[PDB]
Amino acid sequence: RPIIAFMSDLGTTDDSVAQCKGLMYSICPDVTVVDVCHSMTPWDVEEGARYIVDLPRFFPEGTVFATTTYPATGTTTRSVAVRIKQAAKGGARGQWAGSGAGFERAEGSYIYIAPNNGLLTTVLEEHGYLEAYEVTSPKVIPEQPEPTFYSREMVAIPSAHLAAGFPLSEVGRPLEDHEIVRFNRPAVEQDGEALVGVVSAIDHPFGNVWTNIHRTDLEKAGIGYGARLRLTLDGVLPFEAPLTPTFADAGEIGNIAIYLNSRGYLSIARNAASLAYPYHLKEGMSARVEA
Amino acid sequence: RPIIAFMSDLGTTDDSVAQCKGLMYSICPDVTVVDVCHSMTPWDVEEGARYIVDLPRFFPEGTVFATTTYPATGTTTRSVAVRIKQAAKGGARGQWAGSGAGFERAEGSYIYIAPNNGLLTTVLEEHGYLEAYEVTSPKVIPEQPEPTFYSREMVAIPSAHLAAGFPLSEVGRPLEDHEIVRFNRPAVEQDGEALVGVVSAIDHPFGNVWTNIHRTDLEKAGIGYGARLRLTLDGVLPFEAPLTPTFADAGEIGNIAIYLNSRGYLSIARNAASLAYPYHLKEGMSARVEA
Amino acid sequence: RPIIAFMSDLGTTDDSVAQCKGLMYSICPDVTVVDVCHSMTPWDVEEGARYIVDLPRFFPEGTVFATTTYPATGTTTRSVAVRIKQAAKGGARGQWAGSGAGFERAEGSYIYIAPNNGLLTTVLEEHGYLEAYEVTSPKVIPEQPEPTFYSREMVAIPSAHLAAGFPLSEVGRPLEDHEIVRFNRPAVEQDGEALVGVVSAIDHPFGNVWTNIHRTDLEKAGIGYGARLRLTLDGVLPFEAPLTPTFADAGEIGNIAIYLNSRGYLSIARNAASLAYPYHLKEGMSARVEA
Amino acid sequence: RPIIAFMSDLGTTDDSVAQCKGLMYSICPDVTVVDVCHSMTPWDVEEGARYIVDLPRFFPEGTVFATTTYPATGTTTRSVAVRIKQAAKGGARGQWAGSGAGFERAEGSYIYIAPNNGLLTTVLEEHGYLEAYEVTSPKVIPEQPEPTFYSREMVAIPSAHLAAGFPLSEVGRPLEDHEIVRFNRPAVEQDGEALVGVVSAIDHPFGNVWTNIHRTDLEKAGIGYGARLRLTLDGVLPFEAPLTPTFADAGEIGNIAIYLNSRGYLSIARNAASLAYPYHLKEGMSARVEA
Amino acid sequence: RPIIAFMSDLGTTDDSVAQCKGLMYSICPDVTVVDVCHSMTPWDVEEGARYIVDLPRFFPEGTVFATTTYPATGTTTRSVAVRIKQAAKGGARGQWAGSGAGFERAEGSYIYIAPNNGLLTTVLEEHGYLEAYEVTSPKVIPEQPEPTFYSREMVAIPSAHLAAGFPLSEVGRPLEDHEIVRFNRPAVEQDGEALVGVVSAIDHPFGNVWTNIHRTDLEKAGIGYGARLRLTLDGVLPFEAPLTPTFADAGEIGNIAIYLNSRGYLSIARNAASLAYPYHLKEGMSARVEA
Amino acid sequence: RPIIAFMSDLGTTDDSVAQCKGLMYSICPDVTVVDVCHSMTPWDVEEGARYIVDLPRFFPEGTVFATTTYPATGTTTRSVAVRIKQAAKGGARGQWAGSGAGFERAEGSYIYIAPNNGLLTTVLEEHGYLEAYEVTSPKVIPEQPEPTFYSREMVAIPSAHLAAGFPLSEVGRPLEDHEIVRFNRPAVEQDGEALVGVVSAIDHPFGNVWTNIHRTDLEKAGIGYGARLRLTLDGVLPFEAPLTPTFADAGEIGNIAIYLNSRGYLSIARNAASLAYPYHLKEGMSARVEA
Numbered sequence A, B, C, D, E, F: 001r002p003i004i005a006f007m008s009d010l011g012t013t014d015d016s017v018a019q020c021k022g023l024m025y026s027i028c029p030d031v032t033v034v035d036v037c038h039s040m041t042p043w044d045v046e047e048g049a050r051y052i053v054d055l056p057r058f059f060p061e062g063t064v065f066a067t068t069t070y071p072a073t074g075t076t077t078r079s080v081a082v083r084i085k086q087a088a089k090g091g092a093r094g095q096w097a098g099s100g101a102g103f104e105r106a107e108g109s110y111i112y113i114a115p116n117n118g119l120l121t122t123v124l125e126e127h128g129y130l131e132a133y134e135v136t137s138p139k140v141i142p143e144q145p146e147p148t149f150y151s152r153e154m155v156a157i158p159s160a161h162l163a164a165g166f167p168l169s170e171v172g173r174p175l176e177d178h179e180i181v182r183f184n185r186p187a188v189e190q191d192g193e194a195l196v197g198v199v200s201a202i203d204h205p206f207g208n209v210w211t212n213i214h215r216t217d218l219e220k221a222g223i224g225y226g227a228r229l230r231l232t233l234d235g236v237l238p239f240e241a242p243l244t245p246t247f248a249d250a251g252e253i254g255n256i257a258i259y260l261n262s263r264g265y266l267s268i269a270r271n272a273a274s275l276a277y278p279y280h281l282k283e284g285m286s287a288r289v290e291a
């Protein structure tokens, strides 16, 4: 019962995703295609990365992740197919997902296929990888690929061959590590006893504010739940709350909560109200946290 | 072939829904997950209720409805799982759905799982229930549930266990009726021989206007198809038309139709034009009908 | 493994599409329902037609295409169900889709079911058809159809019966060709050797600009992939570039590309940037191209 | 433009071949079907082998060879489909076919599909193969195959699916070499400094006599063009002549030529007269050559 | 991609068939001409019938069958063109042809054109017809037809006009049923519990013996696979075998097999040896079958 | 849509013709290859000539006629390629072929390519020619031709290049008329006013008898369609009948018809019965006709 989990920049307003799906069922008749999202900002490989890096622990072993924003579509660039190493625990704690004690996932159990444009930068950093190949064989891509639709030609199509059991190492030649394109991720800076980062995302549809300050950064300023914090956004908004597990800990509806989001990152919100929307807070604003 | 029908407030802009689906396929490998919608206004339990109350008659017997907006995520609250009694006829006329005379559905054939925050208020009113349980067993929820994602931890995951055949009565202790939270439904008032309600929803993407005035409220006033109505909105924007089965009965395109929608409620529209959008008509506006 | 590909104007904000899906699973339990889109402008049959005309070559043989915008819902009109002839090659070049040399599809392999309102106009022009029938049998539609929901009653429900093996010729009487409603496609006209048409679509989410000028319009205008073009939009905005296969051929991020999109038509974009959104370009604006 | 080249034992006296072709055009609408021959002695796998071993170098790359005599039709046996390795030079000299220096053919460019009964023995010996699969998938053969017509059910039909782009590896499980049936090729023996073979074929319609003594058997005896040979047949009818390139080198019409045929093998004829017919010479007769 | 499937009595030894083909390509440049056979006994309309009655299910809808033996060539007789009703299932079981569950063929989807000499007797009996016309219009036949070649003038030529889309009903006037010439087919006689018929054909090139006793005649003496039968040929040869699906069921090579042939008729053969040839068995000999 | 019409002495019993076809498709991928016949008596150039002389008026303009019996294969001889002048009317009367008044063909529209051995003798006599060239260029034949297969090397291969647009004048040097080998046609001679010729062919499969006496030989012998004739064959067998247009004019099945065949020549047959086969009549027997 193979699964392809599909994340693209193709949108939800025309038949582009359906074209790709049609081809997935043609190649792998017993497949289940799970939509991740198709709503990302086109060409923002850093946003795309965010929607896919946390996926593996939630899916059955053998799942293929077909992930693509493809601004170099039509050129002589070719996709990269990689078998990751660690499925990786996640969340505010760092645990397996599922009921009971969670579903432990074996190593070497998921494949990602993507343009070689840095989309997989965070996947490779947080999971590692065992093997990586250029996608070139005409067994798994078109001999005459549509120039403006490499997300279909070079990702959707070969993803389905992989789901159907095409050997990974036969899609094309092995890639050396330096041949895999990466974007740089800005580090969280130690700064006195303060940690200095950015708003990484506005968490839609709620308007929560997510930062790039990870639980591990907090876990060696020595900051746990209960700590009284000052989280300054945009240089000029010094929010103050204790770090709490969840929104309702702030008390009355509308009160500020500082918490660790489900991806493991320091976040700020209001309790059952929107923080970001009324005040137009945005990705890219500064975020400093301290006692 | 189990089905879970999934309605949430998680949105369509990141991987949130997909994480849920991954676990659903993990737990119940044979399952089909049907998206109801994920676009509801967060925390608006009355809106969520409208998207789920009409579902049972459409679905195969044995379908599990996983329905969630979870503003109390991370607190000691626990989800409720209920087996409904009557699948219930619906529509403007009150009938079974499907081809021929429709598909009559047996009693006791659908389970809802939701936060215990009133989301199921109208489901329980219109369908009844046979049994209800608190969802607490670590066989069906996580031992260490993610504080900010109870929509996954306490709804998606246990829904998949129920679809996989986990006995409903084993999810946790039985609930007494007074322990299941309800919201108050605004009452249609009689004011002279006029009926006074509210705009319950704008029917996107068309811009039709739905009220909370039911066909039963109309048949108790002796108002049937053919009747000349004055229907007044927001307390100034008035309208006049006979009650007709459908939009085309208003004649020329753009003309006003007053009709019964597919959920059984008095509604107003323009024939193949939008009523609500040009005039910025809105849910919450007063709606008064006089004959 | 029956598939129904489903394109509607029902939106993504309530349970409308899920009601249809529920019944599709009720009638055809082993079906896969693939969403095309549900976001088209309500009642815009020409837009709807664009989202379905290119589908067949991407899908497995036997796929049913359930395609609906139904402004005449609740009237005496009845749907049309047709088995197309040619699956038809497509793309900027004209090819079968898939890996290798692509996947050929046998003739007569796909059925469309649609309101008889012209929605299938371009499907029948591009693919031809082998048989057509009015959809009237109570074996495949309700005896008492819901007046405002013919997209469910007269499209979704009968599509599921067809997917399940119900004989196409038993749905109702055969329709003559003149009884199948058609829309008039706006023709690409002449002044000098400059082609004058329209913007047929903004290609979301990228903001690329699609015209109704086909590859064939360009050949024997003597415009080939080398040609330096002046393209005026809305009778005001002029652009200049050679015709190229893809976006990156423009050079730097932001540069103008005039190209043939993946559906076979002359289009214009910026390279990994949005052309339409910053200039507020729209469907239905005039488009003029000259060497 | 896919080609299937079709060799069978179905004859030319009824509609058998045509039924096969009808299905081939049905499945692969763009296909060209080329008849090799349908006149072979039924069930004679060694004869069929001779009509197909020399074909690849003549055909465009990507050609599918559908080759069948099927005495085990209706049993549990299943056809084999193999992609050959080397297209292989041929003729009296050993060269590529075609104008100029010939058309060199890339490796891995031809598929044979046949009963697994030894028919492909010489194809595999002379060309090698890259992969071989059992043909079992109901995507490419009938669910209820006609018991007496496996030449259509298990060869013609799947050949058309391969020409239409169905992935070879999806026809069924891979075969190990020992699972592909072979016949034993009769060995050319050395008897003194004479070579002892057999008449392998009468070359109709001319009545030339072909032996199984190869040019490589001759060059290993230091026998080249110009050599005076005694070639003895059926163990009594002897002949004497030099080895020459062609028939006209025997001088007057009716004179004996000893030559290398276009398949690379020692042969004997009369110059523009028949050798075999007047004397009723036959395949299976002994053939001994002394220099 | 129109197809003409061509069956004649013109032979394979001169340019007669090529003349007709040349004219087919002249009239319908995109046509594919599929040879059925050209080897029938001249003027034996009953043999001709046998080569064409089984064709439709194997070919794409819209195929034109050009079928002719024309002993009345040069007279004032004119051909008949008919659109058949049922494509009809066939074979030992009675099923659609092709991979999977077969290709279902729509009604009214094939045209036959023939001399009105009884050639179409079995086509009309087993398929039925919707409309029939005399072929007279000089749009589709020569004004001055070659007297000795009506197979070209009155069949080949108009067949190509029909393939190219000439309206069937415009070739000439409608024919009443009684105006269509039929030969009589001898019935299978019930006779005790024995069924009494004839050898209808020797199945070349194998020498299998085909009778006119159909699966339906067996299917109400109550005779299925496994029944121990006595099949007496020529009054004096009481063969005995169980009815089996195929030849190899008889066991050792040479053993007698009684089976249902691919056309649906009771047949007798030897397993991978010829029955008819060594003993000179012939069409027209008696055939009786019983328990 | 290039066509090659292919007449050889290669037979229908091995892969010889398919080797030629493979290369024709290799060189001219969009070609249609039409078989004329491959069954002529090997090396009988006069028989070969009969099968090709009447072809041009039946085929689309631009058709290449590849026509070969090559007993001088492997010698220094080279083929001749000629563009004929007149397409030429034919038949018992002398007309253009096709529906209506027939299809006129422009002058200079067809090329024949043949061994320079007299095979084209009657083609050049009946049609004339505009240009002729020796076929020597390595652009169109092999540099190292297979000695025993010049029908492939020097006819099939160059025919495909000509079909593809290769300029006829670039195949080799122009040939003067005297360098084109001719055979001597046996002349219809005189004793009294009785015409004395030969049986030119047995018209298989019917067993009709063709003489070398043309319609023109008969006119100004004063023999018209009323004339009562005595025709003696082989100097022994006498027959009597009037000259009629067709076989059925003889009356009862079996009666004698003397007529003009579809190629323009005096012939004799039985009405829907074989004249030649029962009496063992053959090509080359004497034929004598008198009023």
Ligand SMILES: C[S@@+](CC[C@H](N)C(=O)[O-])C[C@H]1O[C@@H](n2cnc3c(N)ncnc32)[C@H](O)[C@@H]1O
Pocket: A203, A204, A206, A208, A247, A248, A261, A262, A263, A269, A270, A271, A272, A273, A274, B009, B010, B014, B016, B042, B043, B068, B069, B070, B071, B072, B073, B148, B149, B150, B151, B152
């Ligand atoms: C935040 S979401 C999980 C999806 C989120 N995008 C993530 O990745 O973690 C889970 C539940 O949290 C509740 N929630 C989200 N933001 C909230 C807030 N600010 N206050 C109260 N509850 C909130 C929502 O009702 C939703 O059902």
Ligand SMILES: C[S@@+](CC[C@H](N)C(=O)[O-])C[C@H]1O[C@@H](n2cnc3c(N)ncnc32)[C@H](O)[C@@H]1O
Pocket: B203, B204, B206, B208, B247, B248, B261, B262, B263, B269, B270, B271, B272, B273, B274, C009, C010, C014, C016, C042, C043, C068, C069, C070, C071, C072, C073, C148, C149, C150, C151, C152
């Ligand atoms: C009303 S929608 C059904 C979904 C709707 N949200 C409901 O729950 O009843 C079904 C068909 O109604 C047609 N429709 C909706 N609003 C209309 C209007 N104002 N005029 C004409 N047709 C309308 C649409 O084209 C749609 O395909």
Ligand SMILES: C[S@@+](CC[C@H](N)C(=O)[O-])C[C@H]1O[C@@H](n2cnc3c(N)ncnc32)[C@H](O)[C@@H]1O
Pocket: A009, A010, A014, A016, A042, A043, A068, A069, A070, A071, A072, A073, A148, A149, A150, A151, A152, C203, C204, C206, C208, C247, C248, C261, C262, C263, C269, C270, C271, C272, C273, C274
């Ligand atoms: C154009 S989309 C195909 C869907 C599109 N609606 C169509 O029908 O062709 C495929 C890839 O093209 C890339 N793309 C789209 N527009 C682009 C542009 N203007 N510049 C560079 N890349 C673009 C996107 O990143 C996407 O993954």
Ligand SMILES: C[S@@+](CC[C@H](N)C(=O)[O-])C[C@H]1O[C@@H](n2cnc3c(N)ncnc32)[C@H](O)[C@@H]1O
Pocket: D009, D010, D014, D016, D042, D043, D068, D069, D070, D071, D072, D073, D148, D149, D150, D151, D152, E203, E204, E206, E208, E247, E248, E261, E262, E263, E269, E270, E271, E272, E273, E274
């Ligand atoms: C009998 S044929 C099908 C054509 C036949 N004329 C018909 O219409 O059914 C299919 C395969 O059957 C095999 N076959 C035919 N006669 C056979 C026999 N007597 N024993 C074993 N196999 C036989 C042949 O090898 C041929 O490839």
Ligand SMILES: C[S@@+](CC[C@H](N)C(=O)[O-])C[C@H]1O[C@@H](n2cnc3c(N)ncnc32)[C@H](O)[C@@H]1O
Pocket: D203, D204, D206, D208, D247, D248, D261, D262, D263, D269, D270, D271, D272, D273, D274, F009, F010, F014, F016, F042, F043, F068, F069, F070, F071, F072, F073, F148, F149, F150, F151, F152
């Ligand atoms: C030998 S055939 C090629 C086909 C043959 N079956 C083969 O596979 O090599 C090619 C030309 O050879 C010529 N040929 C064949 N046998 C000949 C013979 N014994 N003497 C002279 N010419 C011959 C024929 O006229 C024919 O056109």
Ligand SMILES: C[S@@+](CC[C@H](N)C(=O)[O-])C[C@H]1O[C@@H](n2cnc3c(N)ncnc32)[C@H](O)[C@@H]1O
Pocket: E009, E010, E014, E016, E042, E043, E068, E069, E070, E071, E072, E073, E148, E149, E150, E151, E152, F203, F204, F206, F208, F247, F248, F261, F262, F263, F269, F270, F271, F272, F273, F274
């Ligand atoms: C004579 S054939 C044309 C081919 C022939 N080889 C020629 O070149 O004219 C056309 C039709 O004539 C009919 N025919 C041929 N010989 C006949 C005969 N002796 N009596 C009656 N009909 C005949 C056949 O049934 C055939 O369909």
